[PDB]
Chains A and B, each alone.
Chain A
Amino acid sequence: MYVKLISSDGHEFIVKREHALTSGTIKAMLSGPGQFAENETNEVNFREIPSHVLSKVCMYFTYKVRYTNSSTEIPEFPIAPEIALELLMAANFLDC
Chain B
Amino acid sequence: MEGLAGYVYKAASEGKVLTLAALLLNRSESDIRYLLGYVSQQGGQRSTPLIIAARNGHAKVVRLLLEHYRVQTQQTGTVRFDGYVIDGATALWCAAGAGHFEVVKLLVSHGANVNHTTVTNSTPLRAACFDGRLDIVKYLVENNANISIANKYDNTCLMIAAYKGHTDVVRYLLEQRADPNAKAHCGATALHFAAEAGHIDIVKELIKWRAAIVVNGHGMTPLKVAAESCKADVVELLLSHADCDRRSRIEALELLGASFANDRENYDIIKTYHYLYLAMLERFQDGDNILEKEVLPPIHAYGNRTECRNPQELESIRQDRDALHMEGLIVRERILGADNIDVSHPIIYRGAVYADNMEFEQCIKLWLHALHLRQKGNRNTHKDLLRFAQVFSQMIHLNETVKAPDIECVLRCSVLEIEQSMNRVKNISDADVHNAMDNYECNLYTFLYLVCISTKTQCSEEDQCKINKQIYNLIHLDPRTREGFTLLHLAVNSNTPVDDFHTNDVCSFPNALVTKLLLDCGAEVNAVDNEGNSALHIIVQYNRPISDFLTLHSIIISLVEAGAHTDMTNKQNKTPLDKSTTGVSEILLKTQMKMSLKCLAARAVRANDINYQDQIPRTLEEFVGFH
Contacts and interface: CB of A to CB of B under 8 A. Distances in A.
Direct contact of A and B (CB under 8 A): yes
B83 interface: no
A79 B598 contact: no
B-side interface mostly: helix
A79 B602 CA distance: 10
A79 B601 contact: yes
Nearest to B593: A74
Contact of A89 (B595, B596, B616): B616
A91 B624 CA distance: 13
Interface in A52-96: 57, 60, 64, 72, 74, 77, 79, 81, 84-85, 87-89, 91-92, 94, 96
Contacts of B595: 64, 74
A85 B616 contact: yes
B299 interface: no
Interface stretch (B375-383, B393-401, B604-612): B604-612
B602 A88 contact: yes
A87 B598 CA distance: 8
A96 B596 CA distance: 6
Nearest to B599: A91
Contacts of B600: 60, 77, 79
Contacts of B617: 89, 92
Given A72-B590, A85-B615, A91 B604 contact: no
B569 to A, nearest CB: 15
Contacts of A94: 597
Contact of B608 (A72, A77, A81, A92): A81
A87 B597 contact: yes
A79 B623 CA distance: 17
B590 A92 contact: no
Interface residues of A, number: 18
Interface string A36-57: 0000000000000000000001
Contacts of A91: 596-598, 601
A81 B610 contact: yes
B620 interface: yes
A83 B327 CA distance: 82
A62 B422 CA distance: 52
Contact of B620 (A23, A60, A74, A89): A89
A88 B590 contact: no
Nearest to A67: B595
Interface in B542-573: none
Contacts of B596: 91, 96
Interface residues of B, number: 19
A85 B620 contact: no
Contacts of B624: 88
A88 B620 contact: yes
Most buried by A among B600, B602, B623: B600
A60 B620 CA distance: 20
A57 B617 CA distance: 19
A77 B596 CA distance: 11
A60 B595 CA distance: 11
Nearest to B619: A92
Contacts of B608: 81, 84
A14 B195 CA distance: 94
B274 to A, nearest CB: 80
Contact of B605 (A74, A88, A96): A88
A74 B623 CA distance: 23
A85 B605 contact: yes
Contact of A79 (B590, B604, B616): B604
B597 to A, nearest CB: 4
Contacts of B612: 85
Interface in B363-379: none
A20 B596 CA distance: 13
B610 A92 contact: no
B565 to A, nearest CB: 15
Contacts of B623: 88, 92
A82 to B, nearest CB: 9
A94 B597 CA distance: 10
A18 B525 CA distance: 32
A57 B597 CA distance: 8
B67 to A, nearest CB: 80
B605 A92 contact: no
B347 to A, nearest CB: 59
A66 B601 CA distance: 19
A43 B459 CA distance: 56
Contacts of A81: 604, 608, 610
Contact of B597 (A60, A74, A85): A60
A92 B598 contact: yes
A82 B188 CA distance: 78
Most buried by B among A85, A94, A96: A85
Interface of A: 23, 57, 60, 64, 72, 74, 77, 79, 81, 84-85, 87-89, 91-92, 94, 96
Query: What are the nearest 5 A-B pairs in CB distance?
Result: A79-B604, A96-B597, A88-B601, A91-B597, A91-B598
Given A72-B590, A92-B623, 19 more contacts: A57-B597, A60-B600, A64-B595, A79-B600, A79-B601, A81-B604, A81-B610, A84-B610, A85-B610, A85-B612, A87-B597, A88-B616, A88-B620, A88-B624, A91-B596, A91-B597, A91-B598, A92-B617, A96-B598
13 contacts: A23-B597, A60-B600, A77-B600, A79-B601, A84-B608, A88-B616, A88-B620, A89-B616, A89-B620, A91-B597, A91-B598, A92-B623, A96-B596
Interface of B: 590, 595-598, 600-602, 604-605, 608, 610, 612, 615-617, 620, 623-624
